[PDB]
C-alpha cells in the first residue's frame, strides 16, 4: 500500500501510472528527487485531485507561490499532497483510500511543472 516516485532535474516523474490495491485502507506515496537542482528552482510536489479539478489546483497554487509549496492553502480539491522538494530531499504523503470514488478520474501532478500521471484503483 505504497509507491516510491521520483522527480528529476528534467521535469520527469519516473512513472506515469499509480495503481492502488482495494485491500488498502490508506496509501502512501514516497516522493524523492534525484539530481542536483535546489527547491527554489526545480522543486517538485506530488498532488492528487480529480482530473476536472487539476487546472484550478495548479492555477491557484502558482498564485500562492513557493513558500506555500505552490499549493493554495486548505484547497478542498486536493485529496492528498506532498510538500515541494529539491534534489536529495524526500517527503511522503498518506491518504484514506475510501476518498477515491467509483467512476471518478484521478490524476497526480506537480503544480509548477508539466508533469502528470494517472492514479487508479486496482
Ligand atoms: Cu515539478
Amino acid at each position: 500500500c505504497s509507491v516510491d516516485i521520483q522527480g528529476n532535474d528534467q521535469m520527469q516523474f519516473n512513472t506515469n501510472a499509480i495503481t492502488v490495491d482495494k485491500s488498502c485502507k490508506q496509501f502512501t506515496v514516497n516522493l524523492s528527487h534525484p539530481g542536483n537542482l535546489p527547491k527554489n528552482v526545480m522543486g517538485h510536489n506530488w498532488v492528487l485531485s480529480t482530473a476536472a479539478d487539476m487546472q484550478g489546483v495548479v492555477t491557484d497554487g502558482m498564485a500562492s507561490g513557493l513558500d506555500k509549496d505552490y499549493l493554495k492553502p486548505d484547497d478542498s480539491r486536493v485529496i492528498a499532497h506532498t510538500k515541494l522538494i529539491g534534489s536529495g530531499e524526500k517527503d511522503s504523503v498518506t491518504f484514506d483510500v475510501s476518498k477515491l470514488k467509483e467512476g471518478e478520474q484521478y490524476m497526480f501532478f506537480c503544480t509548477p511543472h508539466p508533469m502528470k500521471g494517472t492514479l487508479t484503483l486496482k
Side-chain angles (χ1 to χ4, degrees), residues 47 49-64 70-73 75-78 109 111:
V47 187
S49 74
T50 64
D53 282 341
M54 172 168 68
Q55 180 171 303
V57 171
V58 173
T59 291
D60 290 350
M62 296 315 290
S64 299
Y70 296 121
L71 282 162
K72 180 173 65 186
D75 191 327
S76 67
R77 297 169 293 200
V78 173
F109 49 97
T111 57

Side-chain angles (χ1 to χ4, degrees), residues 87-98 100 102:
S87 71
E89 303 181 328
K90 293 185 292 210
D91 193 23
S92 300
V93 59
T94 298
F95 62 93
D96 184 347
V97 173
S98 77
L100 304 178
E102 270 308 287

Side-chain angles (χ1 to χ4, degrees), residues 1 6 39 57 98:
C1 300
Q6 299 169 9
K39 185 162 97 176
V57 171
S98 77

Side-chain angles (χ1 to χ4, degrees), residues 7-8 11-13 33 42-46 84-85 109-115:
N8 70 8
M11 296 190 311
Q12 297 165 338
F13 281 132
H33 189 330
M42 185 58 66
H44 301 312
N45 55 24
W46 182 93
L84 204 75
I85 63 169
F109 49 97
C110 177
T111 57
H113 300 126
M115 295 155 67

